[PDB]
Structure formats: structure tokens, C-alpha cells
């Protein structure tokens, strides 16, 4: 199936608290595999997955030199944007970037992206054509003109279509056996009182990997796509995820409801209901 290599980059100014913080995090198929953080005593890209330990010192040096170089260039960018937006030197501001390639099973580029934000709002992005830019505001028009003159889209496209794709292939070779792991959700129903003649049934999905999951409650074979409470999917903290969905039902009618759990790791969706303790 499809794969991806993305870097999420953050630079945050901190007037009166020292130099700006620069963090770069790399992801393979949405999994963190390298990280650089300018706030370390000796800033360097570090492996964040065991399978990256294989890369020799020349790799880590080359990567670290790019990070330190861009740390300093992003420091300047922060000052540049203070001018573009006519802002004071006393406030903290953020530049964020998401860059990378999604490749299909056939090894062709499905999507290449390069998206910037300033203070949490869209700034500039490379278009789907990998040739032109979308500037979100007046300030980003200045950057756009600089980049169209510099032929930046062509340099970036080469990275996205070439370098990125080729390095993704290399990382996947080392990481595929680890990245492939999926943990299917284990599910159970809990029972809680409500006022009067109602009870809450809460369907739990625990221990699952890829975060993506759907929980539904049904009465008969019809989904209760309203009056059902749920939580955002959340990390257990051990690399697995949690979610729940609850419904309010009549006291005595608990056995009329069934919870449905849908996950990519499940060959068939889970079916369960409230069962009182053994």
C-alpha cells in the first residue's frame, strides 16, 4: 500500500528568553523516526526508532548540518516576518512547516506537499502541480515573488519527486518489519447509573494501534448516530490508543444494544454488549 516521509518543523522566537527554538521531526508512514531540537546541549538529529540506529555517522552529520543551517535561517525568517507584518520585537512568534511525499504502492508520488504557517495560520503552500505557490495573505506574496524568481519550486519538486521518494525507500527497507505492526482493539462494555430509569453503556476500545477507529452503538441493526457521547481517540502512552462511545438506555433493556468496533486490524468488526460480572 501507500507510504510517506514528512518533516514537521517549528521555530519559535522567545525575546528575553534566549535564541529561538528550532525543532525538526521526521515521520515515516506517520511514525516519528528522527528528531532535532535546538534546545539540547549539543543539538543533533537523533534516531527515534531503533531501525534508524543503522545509519552511519556521515548520515547524522549531513542531517544535523541541514538542521543547524535552517535553525539559523529560520531565526532570520522570524525577524523578516516581524517586518512583513509590522510587529514589535518583544512578542513570541511561530513558523511551522509540513514537508514531504506520499507514494503509492507502485512507487509513484501521490502527493507532495510544502505548507507553511505563521502564528498558526496558513502562510504559503506549494500547489498540487508542484510548480506554483498559494500565498494566504499579502506578506506571503513577498515570499512567493522571492521564490518564483529563485526557481524554488523546481528545487523543491526535485526533492519531493526524487530525494524524498528515494530516502523513503531506504527508510522503509530498514523499518518495514517494525512499521508493519498493527494492534487490534480489545473491547469491553461498562455500565453506569443515570438519574431515574436510565443507564449509561460505555463501549471501550483499548490497546489498538493505528489511531483510526470507529465505534457505533445499535438498537436492533440501526445505528444511534445521535445521543451518543464519545471521546477523541487518545494515546495510552505505551504506543497504543484508546477510545470510547457511550449511549443512554432504559434500565432493564441493556441487552437490546450492541457496540460495533471498526478498525483496520479487525478482519471483521467487533460485536459486543453489556454483560454483568461473572
Amino acid at each position: 500500500g501507500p507510504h510517506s516521509l514528512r518533516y514537521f518543523v517549528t521555530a519559535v522566537s522567545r525575546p528575553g528568553l534566549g535564541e529561538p527554538r528550532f525543532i525538526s521531526v521526521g515521520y515515516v508512514d506517520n511514525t516519528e523516526f528522527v528528531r532535532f531540537d535546538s534546545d539540547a546541549e549539543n543539538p543533533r538529529y537523533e534516531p527515534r526508532a531503533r531501525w534508524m540506529e543503522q545509519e552511519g555517522p556521515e548520515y547524522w552529520e549531513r542531517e544535523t548540518q541541514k538542521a543547524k543551517g535552517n535553525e539559523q535561517s529560520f531565526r532570520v525568517d522570524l525577524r523578516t516576518l516581524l517586518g512583513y507584518y509590522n510587529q514589535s520585537k518583544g512578542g513570541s512568534h511561530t513558523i511551522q512547516v509540513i514537508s514531504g511525499c506520499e507514494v503509492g504502492s507502485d512507487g509513484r508520488l501521490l502527493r507532495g506537499y510544502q505548507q507553511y504557517a505563521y502564528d498558526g495560520c496558513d502562510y504559503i503552500a506549494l500547489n498540487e502541480d508542484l510548480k506554483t505557490w498559494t500565498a494566504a495573505d499579502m506578506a506571503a506574496l513577498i515570499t512567493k515573488h522571492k521564490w518564483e524568481q529563485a526557481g524554488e519550486a523546481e528545487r523543491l519538486r526535485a526533492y519531493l519527486e526524487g530525494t524524498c521518494v528515494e530516502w523513503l525507500r531506504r527508510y522503509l527497507k530498514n523499518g518495514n518489519a517494525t512499521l508493519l505492526r498493527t494492534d487490534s482493539p480489545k473491547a469491553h462494555v461498562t455500565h453506569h447509573s443515570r438519574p431515574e430509569d436510565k443507564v449509561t453503556l460505555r463501549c471501550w476500545a483499548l490497546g489498538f494501534y493505528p489511531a483510526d477507529i470507529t465505534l457505533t452503538w445499535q438498537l436492533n441493526g440501526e445505528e444511534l448516530i445521535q445521543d451518543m457521547e464519545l471521546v477523541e481517540t487518545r494515546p495510552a502512552g505505551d504506543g497504543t490508543f484508546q477510545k470510547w462511545a457511550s449511549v443512554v438506555v432504559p434500565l432493564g433493556k441493556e441487552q437490546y444494544y450492541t457496540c460495533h468496533v471498526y478498525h483496520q486490524g479487525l478482519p471483521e468488526p467487533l460485536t459486543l454488549r453489556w454483560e454483568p460480572p461473572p
Binding site: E63, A67, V76, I95, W147, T163
Partner: peptide
């Protein structure tokens, strides 16, 4: 492999 970013 990190992209070497241009300036804004």
C-alpha cells in the same frame, strides 16, 4: 532526509 529550506 531533510529538505534544506529557502528563506522567507
Amino acid at each position: 532526509s531533510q529538505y534544506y529550506y529557502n528563506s522567507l
